[PDB]
């Protein structure tokens, strides 16, 4: 049969042909009906929409380019829009269009209805071991599969993860990723999620998403994360520390794990040694999982969220709602030309 | 216990990037 690395060389192929020639303004802003605010952040909303012609509802992430600009993030939100329109896995949302006006820029995902990750998480406390697993073989197959096109993603947490109606994984949030070949140096991410050579202002690599992989698991696992301290200046103390204390009710397996990916030692990290990230899926822990049938989503999922139809949200926080505006002049027109 | 002093910690909700 094909081998994976003869499947990844494909996939290489297909991603480099979207990131050479990006898709641009392939929709507008009134063939969508917008419906509730899914979720916010620094830069704007993400809202659940509907398509006027198809009745498909969609999840449309709206930037204030005036606000990019403001907290220079300009070539971060370039990185990920050119990534997002490129990439094709299981366990990544799907990017159906994107256009700008005078005011915002807009990306319309699948929508991905179940919520966050972090939701589930918090109001269930923590989740056993074969249910993280269940989602930790989704980010180790899709760190693989973006590592391979050169794609370090930079931002992993729940928050950052959405359930789907199968009960799986969808990835979401590239406003960190960029494609790097070398090391890199930006300090960006989440406190909990930082490997100790960002905080140290190193250079580093797709090492550091590894890292993160390990912070997800404990938290998934325990019900907080390893870090935690109300000053993040305090967190930062710890992750450098080398120290992790483990749950009693962590398996020996579990730890090991952990412990491998919560390297502090960048060069004796799981994920960047010889075998890359073939020493992760073949740990003891991962021992039960079927790789393949996770790719293929063939196995059960721990839970299916609950849904009472198309365009219910039941899964997500309600926000405050604010109309759009959009102004009658064109704003960082030149800043955003490839958008 | 650790889950009480993270429960009663500033880090329960969404957490923003740096
Ligand atoms: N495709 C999607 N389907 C459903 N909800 C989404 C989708 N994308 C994002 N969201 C919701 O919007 C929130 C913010 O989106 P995102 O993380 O991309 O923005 P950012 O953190 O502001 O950068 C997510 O945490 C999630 O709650
Ligand atoms: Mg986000």
Redesign the pocket.
């Known amino acids: 049969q094909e081998s994976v690395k003869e499947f990844l060389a494909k996939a290489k192929e297909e991603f480099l042909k979207k990131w050479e020639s990006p898709s641009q303004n392939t929709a507008q802003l009134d063939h969508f009906d917008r419906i509730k605010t ?9 809202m ?1 929409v509907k398509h006027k012609e198809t009745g498909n509802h ?2 449309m ?1 709206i ?1 204030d380019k005036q606000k990019v600009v403001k907290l220079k993030q300009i070539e971060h939100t370039l990185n ?1 829009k050119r990534i997002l329109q490129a990439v094709n896995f299981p366990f990544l ?2 990017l159906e269009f994107s256009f700008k006006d005078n005011s915002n820029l807009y ?1 319309v ?5 179940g ?2 990750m ?2 589930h998480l918090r109001r269930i406390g923590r989740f056993s071991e074969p249910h993280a697993r269940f989602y930790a073989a989704q980010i180790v197959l899709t760190f693989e599969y973006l590592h391979s096109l050169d794609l370090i993603y930079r ?1 992993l947490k729940p ?2 993860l ?1 359930i789907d109606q199968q009960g799986y994984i ?1 990835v ?4 960190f990723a960029k494609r790097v070949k070398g090391r890199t140096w930006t300090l960006c991410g989440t406190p909990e999620y930082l490997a100790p050579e960002i905080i140290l202002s190193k250079g580093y690599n797709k090492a550091v998403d590894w890292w993160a992989l390990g912070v997800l698991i404990y938290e998934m696992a325990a019900g907080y994360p390893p870090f935690f301290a109300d000053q993040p200046i305090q967190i930062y103390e710890k992750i450098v520390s080398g120290k992790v204390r483990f749950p009693s009710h962590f398996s020996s397996d579990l730890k090991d794990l952990l412990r491998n990916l919560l390297q502090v030692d960048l060069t004796k990290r799981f994920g960047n040694l010889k075998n890359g990230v073939n020493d992760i899926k073949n740990h003891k822990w991962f021992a039960t999982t079927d790789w393949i049938a996770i790719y293929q989503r063939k196995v059960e999922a721990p839970f299916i969220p609950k849904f009472k139809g198309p365009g219910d949200t039941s899964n ?2 309600d926000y405050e709602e604010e109309e759009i505006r959009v102004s009658i002049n064109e704003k960082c027109g030149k800043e955003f030309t490839e958008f | 216990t650790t889950y009480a002093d993270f429960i009663a910690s500033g880090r329960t909700g ?1 957490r923003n ?1 740096i």
């Open positions: 899914l979720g916010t952040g620094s830069f704007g909303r993400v659940l969609y999840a992430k930037l990920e949302v799907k990306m995902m699948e929508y991905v209805p919520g966050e972090f939701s931002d928050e950052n959405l969808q979401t949030d590239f406003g997500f926080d | 969404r990037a």
